[PDB]
Short mmCIF file of C-alpha atoms and ligand atoms in Angstrom, two decimals:
data_model
loop_
_atom_site.label_atom_id
_atom_site.label_comp_id
_atom_site.label_asym_id
_atom_site.label_seq_id
_atom_site.Cartn_x
_atom_site.Cartn_y
_atom_site.Cartn_z
CA UNK N 361 -200.18 61.35 -108.34
CA UNK N 362 -200.01 64.98 -107.23
CA UNK N 363 -199.28 65.95 -103.60
CA UNK N 364 -201.14 69.28 -103.85
CA UNK N 365 -204.21 67.49 -105.15
CA UNK N 366 -203.95 64.86 -102.40
CA UNK N 367 -203.46 67.46 -99.64
CA UNK N 368 -206.49 69.47 -100.79
CA UNK N 369 -208.67 66.32 -100.81
CA UNK N 370 -207.58 65.40 -97.31
CA UNK N 371 -208.39 68.92 -96.01
CA UNK N 372 -211.83 68.87 -97.69
CA UNK N 373 -212.50 65.37 -96.29
CA UNK N 374 -211.65 66.60 -92.77
CA UNK N 375 -214.03 69.60 -93.13
CA UNK N 376 -216.80 67.33 -94.43
CA UNK N 377 -216.35 64.95 -91.46
CA UNK N 378 -216.48 67.81 -88.92
CA UNK N 379 -219.50 69.23 -90.71
CA UNK N 380 -221.38 65.94 -90.54
CA UNK N 381 -220.51 65.53 -86.83
CA UNK N 382 -220.47 68.95 -85.15
CA UNK N 383 -224.20 69.38 -84.43
CA UNK N 384 -224.62 66.53 -81.85
CA UNK N 385 -221.15 66.95 -80.31
CA UNK N 386 -219.56 68.31 -77.10
CA UNK N 387 -216.17 70.19 -77.16
CA UNK N 388 -214.36 66.95 -76.33
CA UNK N 389 -215.39 65.65 -79.75
CA UNK N 390 -215.04 68.81 -81.86
CA UNK N 391 -211.68 70.17 -80.64
CA UNK N 392 -209.88 67.08 -82.11
CA UNK N 393 -211.89 67.59 -85.34
CA UNK N 394 -210.72 71.20 -85.69
CA UNK N 395 -207.20 69.97 -84.88
CA UNK N 396 -207.36 67.37 -87.77
CA UNK N 397 -208.50 70.14 -90.17
CA UNK N 398 -205.66 72.38 -88.90
CA UNK N 399 -202.97 69.76 -89.49
CA UNK N 400 -204.31 69.00 -92.98
CA UNK N 401 -204.10 72.74 -93.69
CA UNK N 402 -200.55 72.93 -92.36
CA UNK N 403 -199.63 69.96 -94.60
CA UNK N 404 -201.17 71.56 -97.72
CA UNK N 405 -199.40 74.90 -97.03
CA UNK N 406 -195.98 73.17 -96.73
CA UNK N 407 -196.66 71.24 -99.97
CA UNK N 408 -197.57 74.48 -101.78
CA UNK N 409 -194.47 76.27 -100.45
CA UNK N 410 -192.34 73.43 -101.85
CA UNK N 411 -194.17 73.66 -105.20
CA UNK N 412 -193.85 77.42 -105.78
CA UNK N 413 -190.14 77.18 -106.90
CA UNK N 414 -191.35 75.03 -109.79
CA UNK N 415 -194.05 77.48 -111.00
CA UNK N 416 -193.65 80.72 -113.06
CA UNK N 417 -192.59 83.87 -111.13
CA UNK N 418 -195.74 85.68 -112.33
CA UNK N 419 -197.97 83.18 -110.51
CA UNK N 420 -196.19 83.36 -107.14
CA UNK N 421 -198.04 86.34 -105.67
CA UNK N 422 -201.55 85.03 -106.35
CA UNK N 423 -200.71 81.58 -104.95
CA UNK N 424 -199.26 83.26 -101.85
CA UNK N 425 -202.42 85.35 -101.30
CA UNK N 426 -204.54 82.18 -101.63
CA UNK N 427 -202.30 80.63 -98.91
CA UNK N 428 -202.72 83.57 -96.50
CA UNK N 429 -206.51 83.45 -97.00
CA UNK N 430 -206.59 79.74 -95.92
CA UNK N 431 -204.50 80.63 -92.89
CA UNK N 432 -206.93 83.37 -91.93
CA UNK N 433 -209.85 80.93 -92.54
CA UNK N 434 -208.29 78.52 -90.03
CA UNK N 435 -207.93 81.38 -87.49
CA UNK N 436 -211.65 82.17 -87.88
CA UNK N 437 -212.60 78.51 -87.33
CA UNK N 438 -210.36 78.32 -84.24
CA UNK N 439 -211.98 81.54 -82.94
CA UNK N 440 -215.52 80.18 -83.40
CA UNK N 441 -214.55 76.83 -81.83
CA UNK N 442 -213.18 78.64 -78.72
CA UNK N 443 -216.45 80.60 -78.56
CA UNK N 444 -218.53 77.43 -79.00
CA UNK N 445 -216.63 75.88 -76.09
CA UNK N 446 -217.18 78.94 -73.89
CA UNK N 447 -220.94 79.01 -74.43
CA UNK N 448 -221.22 75.24 -74.03
CA UNK N 449 -224.54 74.11 -72.51
CA UNK N 450 -226.11 77.53 -73.28
CA UNK N 451 -228.36 78.97 -76.00
CA UNK N 452 -225.39 80.48 -77.86
CA UNK N 453 -224.08 76.89 -78.19
CA UNK N 454 -225.74 76.11 -81.54
CA UNK N 455 -225.19 79.65 -82.87
CA UNK N 456 -221.40 79.39 -82.46
CA UNK N 457 -221.32 75.80 -83.80
CA UNK N 458 -223.16 77.03 -86.91
CA UNK N 459 -220.49 79.70 -87.28
CA UNK N 460 -217.77 77.06 -86.96
CA UNK N 461 -219.44 75.15 -89.80
CA UNK N 462 -219.57 78.31 -91.91
CA UNK N 463 -215.89 78.98 -91.23
CA UNK N 464 -214.99 75.36 -92.12
CA UNK N 465 -217.01 75.52 -95.35
CA UNK N 466 -215.15 78.75 -96.34
CA UNK N 467 -211.82 77.00 -95.60
CA UNK N 468 -212.85 74.13 -97.98
CA UNK N 469 -213.91 76.54 -100.76
CA UNK N 470 -210.62 78.42 -100.36
CA UNK N 471 -208.63 75.17 -100.53
CA UNK N 472 -210.36 74.36 -103.85
CA UNK N 473 -209.69 77.85 -105.17
CA UNK N 474 -206.00 77.46 -104.27
CA UNK N 475 -205.92 74.15 -106.25
CA UNK N 476 -207.48 76.00 -109.22
CA UNK N 477 -204.83 78.76 -109.05
CA UNK N 478 -201.97 76.21 -108.91
CA UNK N 479 -203.56 74.19 -111.74
CA UNK N 480 -203.64 77.28 -114.02
CA UNK N 481 -200.01 78.11 -113.02
CA UNK N 482 -199.02 74.57 -114.05
CA UNK N 483 -200.83 75.00 -117.41
CA UNK N 484 -199.02 78.35 -117.85
CA UNK N 485 -195.76 76.55 -117.08
CA UNK N 486 -196.28 74.11 -120.01
CA UNK N 487 -196.40 77.23 -122.17
CA UNK N 488 -192.85 78.24 -121.18
CA UNK N 489 -190.65 75.18 -121.86
CA UNK N 490 -187.31 75.17 -123.77
CA UNK N 491 -186.16 72.87 -126.69
CA UNK N 492 -182.98 71.32 -125.14
ZN1 ZN Y 338 -191.66 84.08 -105.96
ZN1 ZN Y 339 -221.83 75.90 -95.69
#
């Protein structure tokens, strides 16, 4: 029932689709795939921003560093995609596509880590309630 959980799943599902599709694909197919991953990231980041005011102050910094890491993971993917599109129909085609896949996989791992960090913050938050 949890929007952070749903947003992470969507982002991972987008990365898994691109991953399963990128090898036999021209730019016209893989630009939209990167764009779907991007928007799912943007969605997750907005959800997390809206969640932070609920979580303990001591957890804020580590969540925020996990957010910045995903943002820099998306920049890396975009970089490698632009490079894969430049060396289209060459012998650096596959190389750059393999680096896209690596960057996407990193993005998925980092989304899962961010879920882990928020999940522990939520457990910590149960520990600091108040009687009435
Ligand atoms: Zn804060
Ligand atoms: Zn991988």
